[PDB]
Structure 1
Amino acid sequence: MWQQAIGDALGITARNLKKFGDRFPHVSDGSNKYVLNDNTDWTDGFWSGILWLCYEYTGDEQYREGAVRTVASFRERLDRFENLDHHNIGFLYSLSAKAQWIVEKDESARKLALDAADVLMRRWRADAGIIQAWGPKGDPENGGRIIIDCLLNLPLLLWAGEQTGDPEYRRVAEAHALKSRRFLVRGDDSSYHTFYFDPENGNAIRGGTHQGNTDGSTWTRGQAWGIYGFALNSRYLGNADLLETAKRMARHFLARVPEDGVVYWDFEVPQEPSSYRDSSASAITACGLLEIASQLDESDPERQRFIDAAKTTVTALRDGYAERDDGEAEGFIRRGSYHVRGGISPDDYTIWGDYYYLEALLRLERGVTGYWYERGR
């Protein structure tokens, strides 16, 4: 039921690895070909994650060799501090360096991940009690802003905390997670994309977005980041409240899935066929659902209900958005959207979409849970 889907992904990945060389895929832009970069964006780690997933499934060394090469690329990126002045250090190094340590216990990868965790830690603003999303410290407009995406970048810190025994990692991680729950999540279980606090004291100011339709809409990927993100912090912290929030945001998402099973880019715009979609949001959510389920009690009937929703979602992605390995297609799933309001790849492949789509398949077929935490933790 999942072998066929995985099969096409494996084939597409093998071809890409040869085609791309040492370059990294980000998103497509009006075609079945990925636009590449020299490891300079926030999405580069997803390529690494895909390669490590393919290796774990097949045992095929060509995948492992490609992943190892990206790790070397990440060491260079880190020791040069190239475009890392943001919170996405987690997405970047959890799926690359920490991934290798999770897969084969490579001490060298472990240290790199730890090195990367230290840099991310210096993004914490004591006065505001948050981890700054974008820009250098004190940035006039972003110095006190947090984003729901950041929840997915906390696993790197939490993992490092357990690795080093340094309590500060978990302290700042839990604090930021709770702050996010109070201000980014809304009363109807929906969510804001970003939230602003007073840099001087950390007082709440306002919620808002630059990727969602309006400050008060629900950017589906934002919601997705929340679902999976809160569930991941929930696991590390053993926080029943964060888990509850994950489930709330999940149920909200599920009740707004359109007919073909894959969501539009924002829940608060007309849910019409001519509107852009965001397959990546559905992909992230499928993983979120499985993570939540994995934390529930067996007697919890909602557990199987989430697993089934995750399956239905992956199946929906497979039947309507997945690319068959036709020798040309470079992406796993179509119709992802990067920045709709901005006009940037609103109907294309997204490397993160591809990663979560595969992680979902690996979770469902082999019980392989990705690289957010140690296997068996």
Structure 2
Amino acid sequence: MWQQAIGDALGITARNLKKFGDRFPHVSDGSNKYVLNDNTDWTDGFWSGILWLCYEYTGDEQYREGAVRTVASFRERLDRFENLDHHDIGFLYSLSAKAQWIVEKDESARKLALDAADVLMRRWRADAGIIQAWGPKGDPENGGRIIIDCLLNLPLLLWAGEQTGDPEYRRVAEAHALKSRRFLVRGDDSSYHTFYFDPENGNAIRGGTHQGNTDGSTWTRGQAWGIYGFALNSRYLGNADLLETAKRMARHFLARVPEDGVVYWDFEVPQEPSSYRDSSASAITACGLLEIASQLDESDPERQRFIDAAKTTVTALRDGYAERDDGEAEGFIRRGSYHVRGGISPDDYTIWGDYYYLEALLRLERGVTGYWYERGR
């Protein structure tokens, strides 16, 4: 079943909240403890998301109150504009502020999410037709660079558009999603991690990565962002081409899943136990597979195959990577990897991996779909 798997996450989270205090987990670094920050990275929202998911599952207010405290932290982060000059505003605010709006319709949370969407819109570069991933506008190196994870940040914009009625949100999100499909996805259904465009006109320059093994390899977390990301955008935009792309990327991913059911950090490196894994890529994909399935007609025989593939992925994670609540462990799943090439936490907990693992469990057990879009939209 999924209840006991969720149970370990619930225990770990309740204990973590009392240990972390108002701090946020990011990744572990050689031990079963998370390295923490004061809401200054791109991953802080995943902690908020975990707290909200735990609350939705239990109705236990210790989780809600912790989540509300993180939302207060995000309100302050925005007012001080601390490290928000990047495109991961969605990861940060959809899972915290927007989540509170989805869970209990808190108007102040809704305002914060909209204020955040406004900030993300500031990353749009009209001349290049893209949302700049990192660095200040005009950055000589990153001024016209997009990264595939931006796809999961578009939901914040799409949601804001549906809340305000301002067509500009959807226009920008749609343009970026389509440009990502054309240049980040490859002809063999694999994908580039990032792509560079001329800041002045938007002409395509080249694809590449600082995380994947090589510019032309297939970094598994990147492939995973594509699977879930394109599916989330296909739902909002009602675009069958984006859904087709998510399915193509999903099949490419699934065909390269190793024996134990959890992927290595890159598909183009030795696929043997000696290579680092990335349990987070498998967790993200599990959610993406379920999102894809939810958009297919029940008469489609592949719908059940996507659902079963997701269940198989979650089972593989639970059996070979999930941590039991032993009163010490602070993460849900082991062997995630942050930056293998840089030697940064290559075999550790990753808060995003934990969030997606828990979202997959909630999707399977309660039909709870997270905070990328309004329930039963």
Question: TM range, normalised to the smaller chain?
Answer: over 0.9
CA distance in 2, matches of 1:242, 1:105: 30
Whether 1:335 aligns to 2:325 is no
CA distance in 2, matches of 1:147, 1:125: 14
1:176-196: per-residue Cα shift (whole Å, max 9, x none)?
000000000000000000000
CA distance in 2, matches of 1:10, 1:122: 37
CA distance in 1, matches of 2:318, 2:161: 37
CA distance in 2, matches of 1:279, 1:323: 12
CA distance in 2, matches of 1:207, 1:328: 42
For residue 35 of structure 1, give the secondary structure of its aligned residue in structure 2: strand
1:142-200: per-residue Cα shift (whole Å, max 9, x none)?
00000101001000000000000000000000000000000000000000000001111
CA distance in 2, matches of 1:212, 1:297: 35
Q: Which position in structure 2 is the counterpart of 1:115?
A: 115
CA distance in 2, matches of 1:150, 1:349: 22
Alpha-carbon distance, 1:111 to partner? 0.2
CA distance in 2, matches of 1:52, 1:38: 19
CA distance in 2, matches of 1:210, 1:225: 16
CA distance in 2, matches of 1:117, 1:261: 36
For residue 153 of structure 2, give the secondary structure of its aligned residue in structure 1: helix
* Structure 2: runs of 5 or more not aligned: none
For residue 245 of structure 1, give the secondary structure of its aligned residue in structure 2: helix
For residue 25 of structure 2, give the secondary structure of its aligned residue in structure 1: strand
1:205-233: per-residue Cα shift (whole Å, max 9, x none)?
11000000000000000000000000000
Q: Which position in structure 2 is the counterpart of 1:146?
A: 146
For residue 41 of structure 2, give the secondary structure of its aligned residue in structure 1: coil
Alpha-carbon distance, 1:243 to partner? 0.3
CA distance in 2, matches of 1:346, 1:8: 24
Structure 1 stretches (4+) deviating beyond 4 angstroms?
none
CA distance in 2, matches of 1:128, 1:74: 30
Alpha-carbon distance, 1:119 to partner? 0.5
CA distance in 1, matches of 2:188, 2:9: 37
Alpha-carbon distance, 1:245 to partner? 0.2
CA distance in 1, matches of 2:102, 2:263: 32
1:292-330: per-residue Cα shift (whole Å, max 9, x none)?
000000001100000000000000000000000000000
For residue 341 of structure 1, give the secondary structure of its aligned residue in structure 2: helix
Q: Which position in structure 2 is the counterpart of 1:173?
A: 173
CA distance in 2, matches of 1:154, 1:135: 18
The TM-score normalised by the length of structure 1 is 1.00
CA distance in 1, matches of 2:79, 2:168: 23
CA distance in 2, matches of 1:73, 1:187: 43
CA distance in 2, matches of 1:123, 1:30: 35
CA distance in 2, matches of 1:361, 1:75: 29
CA distance in 2, matches of 1:248, 1:159: 26
CA distance in 1, matches of 2:123, 2:330: 35
CA distance in 2, matches of 1:24, 1:13: 12
* Structure 1: runs of 5 or more not aligned: none
1:319-368: per-residue Cα shift (whole Å, max 9, x none)?
00000000000000000000000111000000000000000000000000
1:109-129: per-residue Cα shift (whole Å, max 9, x none)?
000000000010010000000
Alpha-carbon distance, 1:4 to partner? 1.1
CA distance in 2, matches of 1:122, 1:44: 20
Q: Which position in structure 2 is the counterpart of 1:207?
A: 207
Q: Which position in structure 2 is the counterpart of 1:103?
A: 103
The TM-score normalised by the length of structure 2 is 1.00
CA distance in 2, matches of 1:122, 1:48: 24
For residue 205 of structure 1, give the secondary structure of its aligned residue in structure 2: strand
1:47-88: per-residue Cα shift (whole Å, max 9, x none)?
000000000000000000000000000000000100000000
1:215-267: per-residue Cα shift (whole Å, max 9, x none)?
00000000000000000000000000000000000000000000000000000
1:261-293: per-residue Cα shift (whole Å, max 9, x none)?
000000000001011000000000000000000
CA distance in 2, matches of 1:94, 1:264: 28
CA distance in 2, matches of 1:232, 1:376: 13
CA distance in 2, matches of 1:79, 1:23: 18
Percent identity between matched residues is 100
Alpha-carbon distance, 1:130 to partner? 0.2
